[PDB]
Design a protein around this motif. Structure first.
Motif, PDB file in Angstrom:
ATOM      1  N   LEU A 236     -12.954 -44.374 -37.504  1.00 36.01           N
ATOM      2  CA  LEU A 236     -12.578 -45.596 -37.494  1.00 36.01           C
ATOM      3  C   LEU A 236     -11.578 -46.129 -36.504  1.00 36.01           C
ATOM      4  O   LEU A 236     -10.939 -47.126 -36.849  1.00 36.01           O
ATOM      5  N   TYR A 238     -11.671 -48.078 -33.936  1.00 37.53           N
ATOM      6  CA  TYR A 238     -12.294 -49.250 -33.336  1.00 37.53           C
ATOM      7  C   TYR A 238     -11.173 -49.827 -32.291  1.00 37.53           C
ATOM      8  O   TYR A 238     -10.162 -49.772 -32.804  1.00 37.53           O
ATOM      9  N   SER A 239     -12.001 -50.960 -31.376  1.00 39.69           N
ATOM     10  CA  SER A 239     -10.739 -51.437 -30.691  1.00 39.69           C
ATOM     11  C   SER A 239      -9.791 -52.467 -31.226  1.00 39.69           C
ATOM     12  O   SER A 239     -10.352 -53.125 -32.277  1.00 39.69           O
ATOM     13  N   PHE A 260      -8.550 -54.803 -36.303  1.00 43.15           N
ATOM     14  CA  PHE A 260      -9.584 -54.515 -35.296  1.00 43.15           C
ATOM     15  C   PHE A 260     -10.060 -55.760 -34.861  1.00 43.15           C
ATOM     16  O   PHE A 260     -10.116 -56.841 -35.442  1.00 43.15           O
ATOM     17  N   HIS A 262     -13.347 -56.761 -33.798  1.00 43.18           N
ATOM     18  CA  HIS A 262     -14.514 -56.934 -34.270  1.00 43.18           C
ATOM     19  C   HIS A 262     -14.571 -57.603 -35.590  1.00 43.18           C
ATOM     20  O   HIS A 262     -15.231 -58.421 -36.079  1.00 43.18           O
ATOM     21  N   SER A 457     -13.079 -49.698 -42.454  1.00 46.92           N
ATOM     22  CA  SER A 457     -14.036 -50.077 -41.123  1.00 46.92           C
ATOM     23  C   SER A 457     -13.454 -51.654 -40.844  1.00 46.92           C
ATOM     24  O   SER A 457     -13.922 -51.842 -39.792  1.00 46.92           O
TER      25      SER A 457
END
Ligand SMILES: O=C(O)c1ccc(O)c(-c2nnc3n(Cc4ccccc4Cl)c(=O)c4ccccc4n23)c1
Length: 483
Positions: A236, A238-239, A260, A262, A457
């Protein structure tokens, strides 16, 4: 990978491993034996070993002499990429992870388990490519795979501290072996490809049997199940670039606890940022931090834009003499403007565990934009740990749910605490699980770590401690018992 985490070692064993098997820049992390709840970062520097304490009371990981982080993997990623950040004041480098060989926290490791029960488990819960690794049966291991339909057993020999399936390559750990045969699948003489698609599920339970699983986890089992979930946090990373922008830095309660990219709430030079994420199950939520003086106006633009009609505040404004969430609402009966947004505090109602504030929110110069926002402020969560009884939290969540359900086309429920990940994640995961049980009834399958992983996530480190983890089980157990 999260192989730098060793779940079953002492400080002496860590010091010995780093001195004999590591070099300068070698590091590992481990749970604290002296303070069960905390962690330690053991680092080799100039021939000597340092043991830096990492504290987690429930809101974040606090690294002595370093920063606050959402997860241990985020902490390690940060310090491995940014040198000089960790420090008598001398710089400590995280160069080489010292890998753990212990298979205990791997999803597929079952330890003591017979070939009969392994076949039982794979016949029920298993599907094509489902597998597990268990102890033999002596001092060796067995890999059991479901294909189709049938179950194949492959003996894993442990010879001179190395593992092999009877020929070819010899591995330093069960993990290296598993990863190797995941990429290079074993082929039976008649052509059956022993594909290792996914580990066998051991956590999904029928809601009605919560008592039996909780009794089994109390024998502790909770620590092992939680650590198996913790190991999956490496997937997990993520950017989180938007929160790093110079212009966004001071809109973060903590510089290294970021939304995150996204799932971040985008607000429509730099006026689009808030440290908040949309949380969608599998009713939506916005998981956010407690406001800063310079983010109060952004907070109200977010509530307006998202059509949110309910806010859950999970902390007192001040706890242990420190601001946890600044007052972003007016006094009872008062009217305030927060940028382009106007808020009236219509009425305040006090309950035992919480205060309700009926707020009216509108955009300045546009009368027809007015909507009521119900703020549920939970005030009895302890200074450290979790409530000793889940009744309070459950009764509160029931009220929030009924308010949210009575409002046509209401947007996501806003949930916020301090960093917006510990208590926030706990309230959200309980609400999600208890929503499953309302719809489907006591005849539903629940999977607590799978639900947690799904929320994680969408925002980093949702649900921070093993104490919160156990609380979620206790709350789900209490709700089902009252049905
Ligand atoms: O550019 C991408 O596509 C991409 C993909 C995956 C990612 O994880 C990220 C990324 N997002 N945040 C980070 N941080 C945190 C950080 C940096 C600066 C200031 C504060 C904080 Cl807290 C890292 O230390 C990091 C380290 C190495 C590699 C990616 C990293 N990373 C970006």
């Amino acid at each position: 990978s999260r192989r730098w985490f060793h779940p079953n070692i002492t400080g002496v064993e860590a010091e010995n491993l780093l001195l004999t098997r590591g070099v300068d820049g070698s590091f590992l992390a481990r749970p604290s034996k002296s303070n069960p709840g905390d962690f330690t970062l053991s680092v080799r520097r100039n021939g000597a070993v340092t043991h830096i304490k990492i504290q987690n009371t429930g809101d974040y990981y606090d690294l002595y002499g370093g920063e606050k982080f959402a997860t241990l993997a985020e902490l390690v990623q940060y310090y491995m990429e940014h040198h000089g950040q960790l420090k008598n004041g001398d710089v400590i480098e995280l160069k080489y992870p010292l890998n753990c060989a212990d298979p205990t926290s791997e999803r597929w490791f079952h330890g003591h388990l017979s070939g009969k029960e392994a076949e039982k488990l794979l016949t029920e819960k298993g599907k094509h490519g489902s597998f597990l690794v268990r102890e033999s049966q002596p001092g060796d291991f067995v890999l059991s795979v479901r294909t189709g339909s049938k179950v194949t057993h492959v003996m894993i020999r442990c010879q001179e501290l190395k593992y092999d399936v009877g020929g070819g390559e010899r591995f330093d750990s069960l993990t290296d072996l598993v990863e190797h045969y995941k990429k290079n699948p074993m082929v039976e003489t008649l052509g059956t490809v022993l594909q290792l698609k996914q580990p066998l599920n051991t956590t999904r339970i029928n809601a009605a049997e919560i008592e039996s699983r909780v009794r089994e986890l109390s024998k502790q089992g909770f620590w092992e199940e939680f650590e198996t979930l913790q190991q999956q946090e490496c997937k997990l990373l993520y950017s989180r670039k938007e929160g790093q922008r110079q212009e966004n830095k001071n809109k973060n309660r903590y510089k290294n606890i970021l939304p995150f990219d996204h799932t971040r709430v985008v607000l429509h030079p730099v006026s689009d940022y808030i440290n908040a994420n949309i949380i969608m199950p599998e009713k939506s939520y916005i998981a956010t931090q407690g406001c800063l003086q310079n983010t109060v106006n952004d907070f109200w633009r977010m509530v307006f834009q998202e059509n949110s009609r309910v806010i859950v505040m999970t902390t007192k404004e001040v706890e242990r003499g420190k601001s946890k969430c600044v007052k972003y609402w007016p006094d009872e009966y008062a009217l305030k403007e927060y940028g382009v947004m106007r808020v009236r505090n219509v009425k305040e109602s006090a309950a035992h565990d919480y205060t309700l504030r009926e707020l009216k929110l509108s955009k300045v110069g546009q009368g027809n934009t007015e909507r009521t926002v119900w703020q549920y402020h939970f005030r009895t969560w302890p200074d450290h740990g979790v409530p000793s009884d889940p009744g309070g939290v459950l009764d509160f969540l029931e009220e929030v749910h009924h308010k949210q359900e009575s409002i046509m086309d209401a947007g996501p429920v806003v949930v916020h605490c301090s960093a917006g990940i510990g208590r926030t994640g706990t309230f959200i995961v309980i609400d999600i699980l208890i929503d499953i049980i309302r719809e489907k009834g006591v005849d539903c399958d629940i999977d607590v770590p799978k639900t947690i992983q799904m929320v994680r996530s969408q925002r980093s480190g949702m649900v921070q401690t093993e104490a919160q983890y156990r609380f979620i089980y206790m709350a789900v157990q209490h709700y089902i018992e009252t049905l």
